[PDB]
Design a protein around this nucleic acid. Structure first.
Ligand SMILES: [K+]
Ligand SMILES: [K+]
Ligand SMILES: [K+]
Ligand SMILES: [K+]
Ligand SMILES: [K+]
Ligand SMILES: [K+]
Ligand SMILES: [K+]
Ligand SMILES: [K+]
Ligand SMILES: [K+]
Ligand SMILES: [K+]
Ligand SMILES: [K+]
Ligand SMILES: [K+]
Ligand SMILES: [K+]
Ligand SMILES: [K+]
Ligand SMILES: [K+]
Ligand SMILES: [K+]
Ligand SMILES: [K+]
Ligand SMILES: [K+]
Ligand SMILES: [K+]
Ligand SMILES: [K+]
Ligand SMILES: [K+]
Ligand SMILES: [K+]
Ligand SMILES: [K+]
Ligand SMILES: [K+]
Ligand SMILES: [K+]
Ligand SMILES: [K+]
Ligand SMILES: [K+]
Ligand SMILES: [K+]
Ligand SMILES: [K+]
Ligand SMILES: [K+]
Ligand SMILES: [K+]
Ligand SMILES: [K+]
Ligand SMILES: [K+]
Ligand SMILES: [K+]
Ligand SMILES: [K+]
Ligand SMILES: [K+]
Ligand SMILES: [K+]
Ligand SMILES: [K+]
Ligand SMILES: [K+]
Ligand SMILES: [K+]
Ligand SMILES: [K+]
Ligand SMILES: [K+]
Ligand SMILES: [K+]
Ligand SMILES: [K+]
Ligand SMILES: [K+]
Ligand SMILES: [K+]
Ligand SMILES: [K+]
Ligand SMILES: [K+]
Ligand SMILES: [K+]
Ligand SMILES: [K+]
Ligand SMILES: [K+]
Ligand SMILES: [K+]
Ligand SMILES: [K+]
Ligand SMILES: [K+]
Ligand SMILES: [K+]
Ligand SMILES: [K+]
Ligand SMILES: [K+]
Ligand SMILES: [K+]
Ligand SMILES: [K+]
Ligand SMILES: [K+]
Ligand SMILES: [K+]
Ligand SMILES: [K+]
Ligand SMILES: [K+]
Ligand SMILES: [K+]
Ligand SMILES: [K+]
Ligand SMILES: [K+]
Ligand SMILES: [K+]
Ligand SMILES: [Mg+2]
Ligand SMILES: [Mg+2]
Ligand SMILES: [Mg+2]
Ligand SMILES: [Mg+2]
Ligand SMILES: [Mg+2]
Ligand SMILES: [Mg+2]
Ligand SMILES: [Mg+2]
Ligand SMILES: [Mg+2]
Ligand SMILES: [Mg+2]
Ligand SMILES: [Mg+2]
Ligand SMILES: [Mg+2]
Ligand SMILES: [Mg+2]
Ligand SMILES: [Mg+2]
Ligand SMILES: [Mg+2]
Lengths: 55, 24, 101, 161, 97
RNA sequence: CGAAGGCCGGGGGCUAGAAGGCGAUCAGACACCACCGUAUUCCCGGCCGUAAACGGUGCCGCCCCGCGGCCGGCGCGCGUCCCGCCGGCCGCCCAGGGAAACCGGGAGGCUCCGGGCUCUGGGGGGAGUAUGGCCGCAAGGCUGAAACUUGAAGGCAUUGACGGAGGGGUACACCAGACGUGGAGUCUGCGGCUCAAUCUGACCAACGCGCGCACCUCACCAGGCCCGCGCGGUGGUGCAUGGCCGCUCCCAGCCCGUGGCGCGAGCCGUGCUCCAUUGCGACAACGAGCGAGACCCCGGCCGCGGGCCGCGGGACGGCCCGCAGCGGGAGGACGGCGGGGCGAUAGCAGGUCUGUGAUGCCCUCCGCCCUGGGCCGCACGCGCGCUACACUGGCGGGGCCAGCCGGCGCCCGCGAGGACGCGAGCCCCCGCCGUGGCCGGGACCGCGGGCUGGAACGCCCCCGCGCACCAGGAAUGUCUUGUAGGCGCCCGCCCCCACCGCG
């Protein structure tokens, strides 16, 4: 049972080599890391809402 | 050598000399 | 990623200071204005001229937001009709210890 | 694989367009999808370029799907593109989730790759390999190469949460 | 090796000997007036859940308790973990926090 | 009297823990890290007498610009404060001092040298050793030489280089990928081996590099003319030199006049941004210059002129929003123009004397020429490449399109090529083969027919013969738009001849 979240904004490049990006998605403010090229108002498939990104 | 261990070495040497001179 | 060198800027400042009346803040008129040899300007190339005019047009729309040196002087000399000087515990002790009080 | 990254209405009478689709970051999101598949198809190395031939290759794989499923080929293509593409990846490897444009990219890539590997050194033609690949990805069948690749990626993502 | 600091690297004024403390990272012995000292006040629950604990609390007027910890580290551990930095010769005289 | 460790005799015994044991790591680990643990750590009575026992600064006394903080006692003032005094502990600091770092409550009042007292030193080693003495249960401690050896050791400070140091930037260096190379055969260069000679240079920045070796080239071998049939000299030395090139480095860096600081080596000048020491703004510095940029060549779009070439216009972070400049939109041929040329100060015992009538000093009279041979010889290891391993393919017939600029007509000949005269491949379409080292792949070899040239050993064509190779270990390279890759075409060296380089 995967859920649909929606990127609310982009926070920055996380890893030591660029790669993933920290994003705020959405009634929540969950913060997560993404590998691909994300714009604003992109819909992501979340396998769980339990884990939150560090920092 | 670090001077502390040189001092340790010299003390062992002097004690060996005293022991050898103890005989006779 | 287009930073103007000091050569553009130093010429653009003398051009704006000398020819304030001629330069509108719109670019084609200034492109012509960085061309005349009567407002004497020896620009030895047209790309150079365009870059200088691009900085001149920008200098124009920054002074709106010489005419601002005549008024600054003409406001440093105004004496109003007042004089701006028309309780104490220790200075009282000092006016008694000086004069009448 | 979202509606905002699979372009339906921009197609032409053949996929050839001469478009500068990769001059900006997100421009290819408006690239037609059959042309994206065509661009992925000519990716063996001895076949670089040779787009005129790949357009035929895809063109004769749409008269096989219409004769097996009996439905619109472009629709089954959209279904295959949507079904494939990992939703979760692993990058001290911790789990992350995948963006839409990358899901579409990896999907189209793995369909092309599955056909490519299944046709080498075989009597079976590469076009009728593409038919198998497309009709089997869109369903969800484990025989699809893109679905097995997706499942592997998602398993490694789960083991690294 | 000339003298680097007027305080000789410690705060010892008009006494012969002072107490021993253990570094909280590596557990070496340090004199008390040399050890790097910081005081921290924080909440027992992280701020990222500080409102969900609160909304799921039965007691009316509850207030999240805090933690009071005095951390003390040696010179090596302080430099390694960036509690203090190596400074320029002019900057070393600055005592501002 | 005297930290800790240590010793003698009693007591006690939680923790940690020399020694010892054990698990890892590692080439080894008897160490660092993990675990278990004896003396010890604690009490009592003694012994020992040492520590970076430090402020590396002996004790008593006098004078000494100032601004603050804290501790103890006391006094005056207002209405806790406030101003003093004595004693203590600290910070900053004018003068003065000093080799400087720095001191400044002295390390001041000192070559303008003298208040009193005690201790210690006299280049570096040998050596705090030998010997004797005193003390100690012991471990030690205190006192303490000489022969001999050596040209420096050492202090404080400057610039650079480096750091498994911190901080800030950055590039196809990595990320996401593509295409490979390394495995097969084969072209070419290198090392070794052989040889009468297989001429020689170079080991990121040597190894398709020193512009195509039958003769010539030619420096090398076997012979032979001249002055079989001084003058020269590609001799040496690029570690004796010029010039040109490469590299540090296409990095953003370098540096002058006047003032200022220091005894001096030296220093100053020399945060926010940009591709950038590009700029804003600040400053004991003020003012200039070089490198950067500007500049030159090419190519996209539009006008006037000529008959496509040759003269100009055009783009500027200019417009509109959001916060010197970073973002997002728009129009336009092109959006922050794009690909090249040039290329600072300072240097490296890279390269080159074998490109010259550049050239010093050494040595040869090894000059010039002719015939033949070698540079290409081959158990073997390496670098750059070429062609493949097939069906996204091979073959047969047809169709049709370039740019760097550029001859082809008519007969013979399967072809290759000859005698005689004058001004593109990929791809597309239609078939064939059918997963079989097969019709994939074309090395090796056997007859022939030609071209070049004084001369094949050079190259081309025809029939036949049909190697290895099934996508390649450990490793390893290049690349972001008309780009990678695929496909061919042309020029250079050139009698002939590209698997090469420039395009
Ligand atoms: K010592
Ligand atoms: K010592
Ligand atoms: K010792
Ligand atoms: K020293
Ligand atoms: K010292
Ligand atoms: K200290
Ligand atoms: K104290
Ligand atoms: K104390
Ligand atoms: K502290
Ligand atoms: K330490
Ligand atoms: K004692
Ligand atoms: K003791
Ligand atoms: K003991
Ligand atoms: K015990
Ligand atoms: K005890
Ligand atoms: K011990
Ligand atoms: K041990
Ligand atoms: K050891
Ligand atoms: K060790
Ligand atoms: K233990
Ligand atoms: K013991
Ligand atoms: K004990
Ligand atoms: K102890
Ligand atoms: K104890
Ligand atoms: K003792
Ligand atoms: K000492
Ligand atoms: K000390
Ligand atoms: K004394
Ligand atoms: K007080
Ligand atoms: K007081
Ligand atoms: K006191
Ligand atoms: K007091
Ligand atoms: K007091
Ligand atoms: K007081
Ligand atoms: K006093
Ligand atoms: K005092
Ligand atoms: K005082
Ligand atoms: K004092
Ligand atoms: K004394
Ligand atoms: K003394
Ligand atoms: K002494
Ligand atoms: K002494
Ligand atoms: K003796
Ligand atoms: K004794
Ligand atoms: K005894
Ligand atoms: K004993
Ligand atoms: K004894
Ligand atoms: K003894
Ligand atoms: K003795
Ligand atoms: K020294
Ligand atoms: K010394
Ligand atoms: K020394
Ligand atoms: K010393
Ligand atoms: K100095
Ligand atoms: K010095
Ligand atoms: K080369
Ligand atoms: K001055
Ligand atoms: K001077
Ligand atoms: K200065
Ligand atoms: K300065
Ligand atoms: K300077
Ligand atoms: K400076
Ligand atoms: K400055
Ligand atoms: K003309
Ligand atoms: K002309
Ligand atoms: K302009
Ligand atoms: K030369
Ligand atoms: Mg005693
Ligand atoms: Mg224990
Ligand atoms: Mg234990
Ligand atoms: Mg002593
Ligand atoms: Mg001492
Ligand atoms: Mg002492
Ligand atoms: Mg105090
Ligand atoms: Mg104090
Ligand atoms: Mg003080
Ligand atoms: Mg003396
Ligand atoms: Mg003795
Ligand atoms: Mg004795
Ligand atoms: Mg000095
Ligand atoms: Mg020859």
């Amino acid at each position: 049972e995967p859920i649909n979240a929606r990127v609310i904004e982009v926070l920055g490049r996380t890893s030591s080599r660029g790669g993933i990006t920290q994003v705020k998605v959405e009634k929540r403010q969950i913060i997560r890391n993404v590998i691909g090229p994300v714009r604003k108002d992109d819909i992501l498939v979340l396998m769980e809402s339990e884990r939150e990104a560090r920092r | 050598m670090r001077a502390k261990w040189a001092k340790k070495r010299m003390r062992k040497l002097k004690r060996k000399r005293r022991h050898m001179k103890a005989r006779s | 990623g287009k930073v103007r060198t000091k050569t553009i800027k130093r010429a653009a400042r003398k051009i704006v200071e000398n020819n304030y009346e001629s330069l509108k803040p719109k670019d084609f008129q200034n492109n012509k204005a960085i061309c005349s040899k009567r407002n004497v300007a020896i620009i030895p190339s047209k790309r150079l001229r365009n870059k200088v005019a691009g900085y001149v047009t920008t200098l124009m729309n920054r002074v709106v937001k010489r005419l601002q040196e005549e008024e600054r002087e003409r406001r440093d000399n105004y004496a109003p009709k007042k004089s701006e000087f028309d309780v104490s515990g220790a200075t009282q002790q000092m006016i008694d210890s000086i004069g009448f009080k | 694989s979202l509606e905002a990254y699979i372009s339906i209405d921009n197609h032409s009478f053949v996929p050839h367009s001469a478009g500068r689709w990769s001059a900006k970051r997100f421009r290819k999101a408006k690239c037609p999808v059959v042309e994206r598949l065509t661009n992925s198809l000519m990716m063996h190395g001895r076949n670089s370029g040779k787009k005129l031939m790949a357009m035929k290759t895809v063109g004769e794989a749409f008269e096989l799907i219409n004769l097996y499923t009996g439905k619109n080929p472009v629709q089954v293509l959209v279904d295959a593109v949507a079904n494939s593409g990992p939703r979760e990846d692993s990058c001290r490897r911790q789990s992350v989730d995948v963006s839409p444009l990358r899901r579409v990219n990896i999907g189209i890539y793995n369909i092309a790759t599955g056909a490519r590997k299944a046709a080498f050194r075989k009597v079976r033609p590469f076009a009728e390999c593409l038919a198998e690949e497309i009709m089997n990805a869109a369903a969800g069948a484990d025989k699809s190469y893109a679905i097995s690749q997706r499942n592997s990626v998602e398993r490694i993502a789960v083991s690294n949460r | 090796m000339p003298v680097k600091r007027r305080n000789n690297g410690r705060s010892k004024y008009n006494c012969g000997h002072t107490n021993i403390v253990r570094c909280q990272n590596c557990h070496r012995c340090v004199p008390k007036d040399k050890v790097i000292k910081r005081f921290t006040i924080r909440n027992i629950v992280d701020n990222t859940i500080a409102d969900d604990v609160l909304n799921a609390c039965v007691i009316q007027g509850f207030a999240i308790p805090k933690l009071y910890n005095k951390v003390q580290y040696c010179v090596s551990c302080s430099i390694h973990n960036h509690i203090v930095r190596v400074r320029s010769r002019e900057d070393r005289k600055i005592r501002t926090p």
